[PDB]
Amino acid sequence: EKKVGVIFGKFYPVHTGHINMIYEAFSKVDELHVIVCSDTVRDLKLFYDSKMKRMPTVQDRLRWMQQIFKYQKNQIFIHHLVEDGIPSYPNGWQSWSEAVKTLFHEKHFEPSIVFSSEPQDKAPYEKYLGLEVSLVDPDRTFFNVSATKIRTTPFQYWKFIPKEARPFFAKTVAILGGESSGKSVLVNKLAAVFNTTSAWEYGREFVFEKLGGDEQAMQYSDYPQMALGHQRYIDYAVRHSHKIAFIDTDFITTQAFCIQYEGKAHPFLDSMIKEYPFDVTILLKNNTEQKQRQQFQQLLKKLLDKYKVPYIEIESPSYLDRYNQVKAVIEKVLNEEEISELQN
Amino acid sequence: EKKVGVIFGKFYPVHTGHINMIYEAFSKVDELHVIVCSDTVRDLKLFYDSKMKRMPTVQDRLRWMQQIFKYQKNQIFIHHLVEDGIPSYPNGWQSWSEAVKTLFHEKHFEPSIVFSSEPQDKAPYEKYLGLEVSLVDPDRTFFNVSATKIRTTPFQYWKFIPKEARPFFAKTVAILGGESSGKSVLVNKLAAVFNTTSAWEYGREFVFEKLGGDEQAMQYSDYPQMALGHQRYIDYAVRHSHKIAFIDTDFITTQAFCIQYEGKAHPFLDSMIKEYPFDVTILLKNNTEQKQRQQFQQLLKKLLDKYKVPYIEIESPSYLDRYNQVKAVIEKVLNEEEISELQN
Amino acid sequence: EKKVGVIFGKFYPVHTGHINMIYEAFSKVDELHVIVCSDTVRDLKLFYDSKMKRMPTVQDRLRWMQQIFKYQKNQIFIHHLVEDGIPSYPNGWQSWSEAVKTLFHEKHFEPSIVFSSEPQDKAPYEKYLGLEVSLVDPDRTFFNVSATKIRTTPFQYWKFIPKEARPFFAKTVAILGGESSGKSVLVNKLAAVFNTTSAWEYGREFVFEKLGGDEQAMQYSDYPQMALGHQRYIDYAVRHSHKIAFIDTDFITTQAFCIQYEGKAHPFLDSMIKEYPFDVTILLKNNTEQKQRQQFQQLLKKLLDKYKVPYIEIESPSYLDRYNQVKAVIEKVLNEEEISELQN
Amino acid sequence: EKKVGVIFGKFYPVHTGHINMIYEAFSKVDELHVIVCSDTVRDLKLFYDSKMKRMPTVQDRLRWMQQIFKYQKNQIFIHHLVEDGIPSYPNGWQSWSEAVKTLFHEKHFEPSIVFSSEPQDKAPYEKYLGLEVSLVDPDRTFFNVSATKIRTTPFQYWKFIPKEARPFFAKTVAILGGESSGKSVLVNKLAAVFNTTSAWEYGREFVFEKLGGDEQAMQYSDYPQMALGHQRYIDYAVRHSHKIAFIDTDFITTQAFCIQYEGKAHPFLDSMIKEYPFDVTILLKNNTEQKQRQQFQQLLKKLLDKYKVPYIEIESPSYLDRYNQVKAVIEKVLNEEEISELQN
Ligand SMILES: NC(=O)c1ccc[n+]([C@@H]2O[C@H](COP(=O)([O-])OP(=O)(O)OC[C@H]3O[C@@H](n4cnc5c(N)ncnc54)[C@H](O)[C@@H]3O)[C@@H](O)[C@H]2O)c1
Ligand SMILES: NC(=O)c1ccc[n+]([C@@H]2O[C@H](COP(=O)([O-])OP(=O)(O)OC[C@H]3O[C@@H](n4cnc5c(N)ncnc54)[C@H](O)[C@@H]3O)[C@@H](O)[C@H]2O)c1
Ligand SMILES: NC(=O)c1ccc[n+]([C@@H]2O[C@H](COP(=O)([O-])OP(=O)(O)OC[C@H]3O[C@@H](n4cnc5c(N)ncnc54)[C@H](O)[C@@H]3O)[C@@H](O)[C@H]2O)c1
Ligand SMILES: NC(=O)c1ccc[n+]([C@@H]2O[C@H](COP(=O)([O-])OP(=O)(O)OC[C@H]3O[C@@H](n4cnc5c(N)ncnc54)[C@H](O)[C@@H]3O)[C@@H](O)[C@H]2O)c1
Ligand SMILES: NC(=O)c1ccc[n+]([C@@H]2O[C@H](COP(=O)([O-])OP(=O)(O)OC[C@H]3O[C@@H](n4cnc5c(N)ncnc54)[C@H](O)[C@@H]3O)[C@@H](O)[C@H]2O)c1
Ligand SMILES: NC(=O)c1ccc[n+]([C@@H]2O[C@H](COP(=O)([O-])OP(=O)(O)OC[C@H]3O[C@@H](n4cnc5c(N)ncnc54)[C@H](O)[C@@H]3O)[C@@H](O)[C@H]2O)c1
Ligand SMILES: NC(=O)c1ccc[n+]([C@@H]2O[C@H](COP(=O)([O-])OP(=O)(O)OC[C@H]3O[C@@H](n4cnc5c(N)ncnc54)[C@H](O)[C@@H]3O)[C@@H](O)[C@H]2O)c1
Ligand SMILES: NC(=O)c1ccc[n+]([C@@H]2O[C@H](COP(=O)([O-])OP(=O)(O)OC[C@H]3O[C@@H](n4cnc5c(N)ncnc54)[C@H](O)[C@@H]3O)[C@@H](O)[C@H]2O)c1
């Protein structure tokens, strides 16, 4: 025999709600085929309509599934269905089931049962696709969540967002400032206090070594690697972030460091800057315990100003203070919003 | 010059409160020495007084620190101080500072400053050890927590327990039952619903292969490895557990499997059984959709009964039901307690 | 359409020769099914006939394949075929192709092409199974190797053995001796000199801490974990061994340590001892630079003697010497053999 | 007391010879300080004098040590000594020992013994630094190797180069060609045959999906990640390369793919191209079993030609052939050299 089932979704994004369902259906079959359906214009409207920074590609999405069901990749399959031109959901099944059928051929599989919620699809599935259907928790008894709720307010529904997607819904807070090191501790204490992650300044060991005598501790061709490692860090922090990820330094800090020590810029750091924007950038100013430091900060603003980097500069007299000021803004990110130079 | 500081603690256990502090002190020094102080009898009373399953050894403790501050192991050091015979805290400093001094010699380091909270120690530190002292968040402004609070009610203070210790405060729930597979899905759905982890049945692929024809899919010398892998799983689940970790099958299930198929027992599975007890063991019985299954369950109870394994057997007519029954008990673990055959 | 191919083998063991082939066939199909065929008695004769320490189970074998082709597990499948009762290779195809057919049904796949070498199978495959066949490097142009060559002399054909199997063909050399620490360095220098791996003594840090004052640095309930970690180490060393893996200490050393400090034994260490034998055990004696050490060595021999642990004791006056003596024996393992108390 | 030793080196590069030594010295001390000494102009001459592609920075070097002795970072330390202006080796000790002394202060450590080979240094060390010295294998009995031998002919001394450095001495061979897929298999078969590694084309799954209908399977903003993953791969391949690492596709192939499908280029791919050159680039042409393929190859040469990418184009009628042609060139890399469009 060999039972075989299908599933359709937009998975924009994928929540523990879908996830659970998919496993459920999977325990009822020997082989399950999971379809990620996209609509260039529809998807596009949902993205812009939301407040998501970057938009998840079809690839980004397929990959989420591809990953979530890796251990079972030998039974659970994942395909992409393109529904462009095909009339809006309520009615188009004739036109839709066409492509579905097409997929089933060029992908060589014939499902005989479909899983879902949205009862309103049973008959139609039965009609145009002619399959046995099976409702599964439509009342949302388990996993009281939706792609729209998460897409609208990520933080209120965080426990429902799989770690594969987190990158499209987490917020990164980068903290620029002088070698004060107060930064790093503050960056760590914050993550601690907010039960979340942080991503150190990659190569901080040499930064401190240079800055000190050693002119060769950090040189022009080092920067690229340094940046790339700082990236490895950030990604772990996001992958595991609770809602926000504190990032010690940012790529601009690295491009700043370079320039100051070589007079040159380095196209690679430039590229990184444009590739990995941050959600919130905070600038720390101090002046109470004289060198070339004031020059770095000068340089940071200049570089920050270019690139059009929205940032909110903090000035403070003592540690404990700075901590509060920052903690304050963050608190507004975890809820409130619209900052830009903050409500001060 | 080269500034150098010390810290004393019992770290029973270690919370994000201590952790934070230690980093703080660390940013004020080039080299920090962290002392884990033990008292055979004192420690012993605290353990038994609590409701912790296993007791953390001196090694277990040193290792927590050893690990938490691994990346900084080149500046932050960790030592063990034995305060047995030395009179109870309030007064004994003369007798205590003796050993401290002894450590500082046989460990070749001379700190010149000490960090802590508990102001009541400044003068004494200044007195008997003669060091500069520095209060740090005594009001517990950040990290409103204590070794006693966590030691008393782990779950209420979970966000304060580092993942290194979790094993001594998390609870494992093992679910025994037939090949029903409903187990596995249920075991996963549970972890999902409770935003926590689960540890699959290692080698489930072959279990299902055997059980089916293939008598060679799982044979006597396989068991040891199988068990050990199931262990790798459990440990990840605990290391990352939210408060509880659902464990598909247990070592007894493996020893049961063996016996049934070889007539023998296997000393190794036996050892594993006695080494890794579980916090809660749940037994699933079914009888509504006839083979040799009833024999396995029979065998499970026999093995469960020996070993003195406290367990609570669940009987149920349909999936959705079983789910509720289980979910019920769990809910009592996350709060209430004392079950043993449950309040039914 | 959807092309689909099969492959048959004993894979006892699996060499880069099979591996290569399988990928080759895989690039010619959309879906490849790889059959591991076993014969209780045949396999059994091949094992005993060889000089392999432990025998690879059907599970051990399926797992090798299961692993080697993990990334492709969604297209390349692996099945077990039982050919017991079925007449010896040359003739039995009628009886053999029966089961093959049976598998193809209860496993729901119908291949239409078979890959192999051994031309002598084309017609028969064409005959009894009726499939298109395709020779692939029968002249062994690439991968001049065989399951028998490796099974006979592993070391001469090491470059052909995948790391998944290495455990069944690598040799472990454990080195027991006093805290001399000369051990560890020697154990490392050896691996270095022989461009191979080594597996440290897990928890050496505390061993040295105990042995010194700290009676609580290593206590009875620590041993189990310590052992298990030492195991994690050994396995990495084997997984990556060049031909041999130097192991600092052995499980008996741990059971010895225990006894000496608790008077008890600990069933768990006992189990480990019986589970993980070593290929060569070397004993280091010294007496030139008085404590309780002579007692440990005494204890090691007593424990070694029981368990029936074949071992070769080395006595030496200075480091450089010991190094040569050891290096000597090893050299005989990489080639010659039969030692037991060595050729001295 | 607390014994403490130093070591000086250029470590250009670091071989298992140095490594071994350093551990040796380490077993004779409680704390060892390892100095990496650089000379802008000297180092620079050694690099150019050799045939190394990229030059190891001071950072690259410190990091090698920093890494090799990570597990022991709490006792073995690593420092950088700048000997610029200080007269050439044979004589300058007065001027050299000055800085050494300076380091010992600003780095707060006072060694009382020095390790090395090169006896000719004992007295001088004794003289200008006044330390107890200790020869260690000067006859190069163990580890018959030198920084110059490796720096001159890496492959002949591969077993002596730690995996941390491999990147500066391994060779990467990238293989460009059409979706033929013959590439990938060939790229893998090569690594197999040469007992070495390979780094697949990251995201090959979608490449093949696009190329086929799916215009959304791989879009403009995907490229950056794709590239970066292909990088993760290459780095593993080098880190573990035997002497050479076969790389499926190269960054130009990715920039080519982009352009062809968006008409644009993407600055990021551009940056990657300039950052990660390859040692040998091979181009595969085919014309025997018509689409838009000929256009890609056209595009590859255009992009290859720009960037000034030295490449050797291979034309061949059948697989087996191509394999030989390639295998041929490689064989010349493992020994001979100077190719550029090859000796054909
Ligand atoms: N044009 C047409 O006529 C036509 C007809 C049928 C389908 N379609 C397309 O097929 C796709 C199907 O999309 P969809 O509605 O399934 O997208 P979706 O991502 O919202 O839902 C995926 C599945 O998850 C289930 N689910 C969601 N949240 C759940 C929760 N909290 N608990 C349990 N289950 C939960 C849903 O019932 C659904 O079957 C769409 O692209 C749609 O436009 C089009
Ligand atoms: N907060 C950070 O940015 C950061 C970066 C590197 C390492 N670490 C910590 O150092 C310890 C081990 O260091 P090591 O000796 O392996 O040095 P390392 O540089 O080799 O560490 C790499 C390890 O750090 C982990 N890691 C990477 N980015 C991380 C992040 N943002 N947050 C937490 N972990 C991250 C990785 O999973 C990996 O196992 C771990 O506790 C690790 O968490 C933290
Ligand atoms: N017998 C004697 O006369 C004598 C005298 C002095 C010390 N001692 C011994 O020294 C050891 C010191 O133990 P301890 O009191 O530090 O143990 P502890 O583990 O409770 O505290 C460790 C440190 O963490 C700080 N801390 C704890 N919770 C915190 C939080 N939430 N936020 C910020 N900081 C926090 C504490 O102030 C303390 O310095 C004990 O073993 C004690 O018996 C004995
Ligand atoms: N829930 C489980 O018990 C369990 C066990 C193994 C793998 N997995 C999952 O399978 C996927 C990868 O499988 P694979 O192809 O590497 O097979 P694998 O058996 O090699 O997986 C080992 C991997 O699983 C992770 N892992 C181990 N125990 C785990 C646990 N209890 N919960 C979650 N992760 C655990 C480990 O960190 C490791 O990376 C991951 O998503 C992993 O989480 C889950
Ligand atoms: N009783 C019967 O009548 C009968 C009939 C047919 C098959 N069988 C069974 O089918 C199984 C087939 O075993 P097998 O002979 O394939 O075992 P095998 O493990 O030696 O070979 C597996 C495959 O690898 C290929 N191969 C091996 N070394 C190679 C190298 N260096 N380079 C390239 N290719 C290489 C072989 O040609 C073969 O197809 C056996 O169990 C056999 O007894 C039985
Ligand atoms: N030779 C050994 O037995 C051994 C054991 C542990 C660590 N190490 C080395 O220490 C360094 C990192 O230490 P850490 O800070 O992560 O401590 P750790 O104890 O956490 O190291 C575990 C790491 O060591 C590796 N490892 C495990 N057994 C190994 C073995 N026999 N040989 C080589 N590597 C092994 C594992 O893959 C893992 O990444 C690495 O260079 C590692 O090779 C060696
Ligand atoms: N200008 C001056 O007067 C003066 C005086 C003394 C030292 N120095 C500087 O100090 C540094 C010392 O450099 P170096 O000569 O040690 O560099 P190196 O990298 O070649 O050697 C490092 C160490 O490894 C040992 N070693 C190398 N290969 C070995 C092998 N195969 N087996 C065993 N041991 C091996 C060497 O004996 C040496 O002590 C240089 O920068 C040198 O110029 C300068
Ligand atoms: N040859 C390759 O380029 C390449 C790339 C990825 C994975 N793989 C193989 O796939 C298997 C596991 O895949 P997965 O399910 O984790 O997918 P994955 O993409 O998550 O695999 C990442 C894993 O592949 C290893 N890896 C990365 N680059 C590698 C390289 N060039 N050569 C060998 N290993 C490399 C990494 O160490 C890591 O454990 C392993 O056998 C791995 O070797 C190979």
Coordinates of N, CA, C and O in Angstrom, one line a residue, chain A residues 205-207 209-223 226 261-262, chain D residues 12 36-44 55-63 80-85:
Chain A
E205 N 40.4 41.0 21.9 CA 41.8 40.7 22.5 C 42.8 41.6 21.7 O 43.6 42.3 22.4
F206 N 42.8 41.6 20.4 CA 43.8 42.4 19.7 C 43.5 43.8 19.7 O 44.3 44.7 19.7
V207 N 42.2 44.2 19.6 CA 41.8 45.6 19.6 C 42.4 46.2 20.7 O 43.1 47.2 20.6
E209 N 45.0 45.1 22.3 CA 46.4 45.0 22.2 C 46.9 46.2 21.3 O 48.0 46.8 21.6
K210 N 46.2 46.4 20.2 CA 46.5 47.6 19.3 C 45.9 48.6 20.3 O 45.5 48.2 21.4
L211 N 45.6 49.8 19.8 CA 45.1 50.8 20.8 C 46.1 51.0 21.9 O 46.3 52.1 22.4
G212 N 46.8 50.0 22.2 CA 48.0 50.0 23.1 C 49.1 50.0 22.0 O 48.7 50.0 20.8
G213 N 50.3 50.0 22.4 CA 51.4 50.0 21.5 C 51.2 49.3 20.2 O 50.9 49.9 19.1
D214 N 51.4 47.9 20.2 CA 51.3 47.0 19.0 C 50.6 47.5 17.8 O 49.4 47.4 17.7
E215 N 51.3 48.1 16.9 CA 50.7 48.6 15.6 C 50.4 47.5 14.7 O 49.6 47.6 13.8
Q216 N 51.0 46.3 14.9 CA 50.8 45.1 14.1 C 49.9 44.1 14.7 O 49.6 43.0 14.1
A217 N 49.3 44.4 15.8 CA 48.3 43.5 16.4 C 47.0 43.4 15.6 O 46.3 42.4 15.6
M218 N 46.7 44.5 14.8 CA 45.5 44.5 14.0 C 45.9 45.3 12.8 O 46.0 46.5 12.9
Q219 N 46.0 44.7 11.6 CA 46.3 45.4 10.4 C 45.3 45.2 9.3 O 44.6 44.2 9.2
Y220 N 45.3 46.1 8.3 CA 44.4 46.1 7.2 C 43.8 44.8 6.7 O 42.6 44.7 6.4
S221 N 44.6 43.8 6.4 CA 44.1 42.5 5.9 C 43.4 41.6 7.0 O 42.9 40.5 6.7
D222 N 43.5 42.1 8.2 CA 42.8 41.3 9.3 C 41.3 41.6 9.3 O 40.5 40.7 9.5
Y223 N 41.0 42.9 9.2 CA 39.6 43.4 9.2 C 38.6 42.4 8.6 O 37.6 42.1 9.3
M226 N 38.0 39.5 10.9 CA 37.5 40.0 12.1 C 36.0 40.2 11.9 O 35.1 39.7 12.7
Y261 N 43.4 53.7 11.3 CA 44.8 53.1 11.3 C 45.4 52.9 10.0 O 46.6 52.4 9.9
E262 N 44.8 53.2 8.9 CA 45.4 52.9 7.6 C 45.1 54.1 6.7 O 45.8 54.2 5.6
Chain D
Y12 N 57.1 30.8 11.7 CA 56.7 31.2 10.3 C 57.0 30.0 9.4 O 58.0 30.1 8.6
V36 N 56.0 35.2 20.4 CA 56.0 35.2 18.9 C 56.7 36.5 18.6 O 56.2 37.6 18.9
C37 N 57.9 36.4 18.0 CA 58.7 37.5 17.6 C 58.6 37.9 16.2 O 58.9 37.0 15.3
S38 N 58.3 39.1 15.9 CA 58.1 39.5 14.5 C 59.1 40.6 14.1 O 59.6 41.4 15.0
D39 N 59.4 40.7 12.8 CA 60.2 41.8 12.3 C 59.7 42.1 10.9 O 59.9 41.4 9.9
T40 N 58.9 43.2 10.9 CA 58.3 43.7 9.7 C 59.0 43.4 8.4 O 58.4 42.8 7.5
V41 N 60.3 43.8 8.3 CA 61.1 43.6 7.1 C 61.6 42.2 7.0 O 61.6 41.7 5.8
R42 N 62.0 41.6 8.1 CA 62.5 40.2 8.0 C 61.4 39.3 7.5 O 61.5 38.7 6.5
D43 N 60.3 39.3 8.3 CA 59.1 38.5 8.0 C 58.7 38.7 6.5 O 58.6 37.7 5.8
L44 N 58.6 40.0 6.1 CA 58.3 40.3 4.8 C 59.1 39.7 3.7 O 58.7 39.4 2.6
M55 N 50.1 36.2 2.8 CA 51.1 36.3 3.9 C 50.4 36.3 5.3 O 49.4 37.0 5.5
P56 N 50.9 35.4 6.2 CA 50.3 35.3 7.5 C 50.7 36.6 8.3 O 51.8 36.9 8.5
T57 N 49.6 37.2 8.9 CA 49.9 38.4 9.6 C 50.4 38.1 11.0 O 50.6 36.9 11.3
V58 N 50.7 39.1 11.8 CA 51.2 38.9 13.2 C 50.0 38.3 13.9 O 50.1 37.3 14.7
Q59 N 48.8 38.8 13.6 CA 47.6 38.4 14.2 C 47.4 36.9 13.8 O 47.1 36.1 14.7
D60 N 47.5 36.6 12.5 CA 47.3 35.2 12.0 C 48.2 34.3 12.8 O 47.7 33.2 13.2
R61 N 49.4 34.7 13.1 CA 50.4 33.9 13.8 C 50.0 33.8 15.3 O 50.0 32.7 15.8
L62 N 49.8 34.9 15.9 CA 49.5 34.8 17.3 C 48.3 33.9 17.5 O 48.3 33.0 18.4
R63 N 47.3 34.1 16.6 CA 46.1 33.3 16.7 C 46.4 31.7 16.6 O 45.7 30.9 17.2
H80 N 53.5 38.9 21.9 CA 54.2 39.4 20.7 C 55.3 40.3 21.0 O 55.2 41.2 21.8
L81 N 56.5 39.9 20.4 CA 57.7 40.7 20.6 C 58.1 41.4 19.3 O 58.3 40.6 18.3
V82 N 58.2 42.7 19.2 CA 58.6 43.4 18.0 C 60.1 43.7 18.0 O 60.6 44.6 18.7
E83 N 60.8 43.1 17.1 CA 62.2 43.3 16.9 C 62.7 44.1 15.7 O 63.5 43.6 14.9
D84 N 62.1 45.3 15.5 CA 62.4 46.1 14.4 C 63.4 47.2 14.8 O 63.2 47.9 15.8
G85 N 64.5 47.3 14.1 CA 65.6 48.2 14.4 C 66.7 47.5 15.1 O 67.9 47.8 15.0

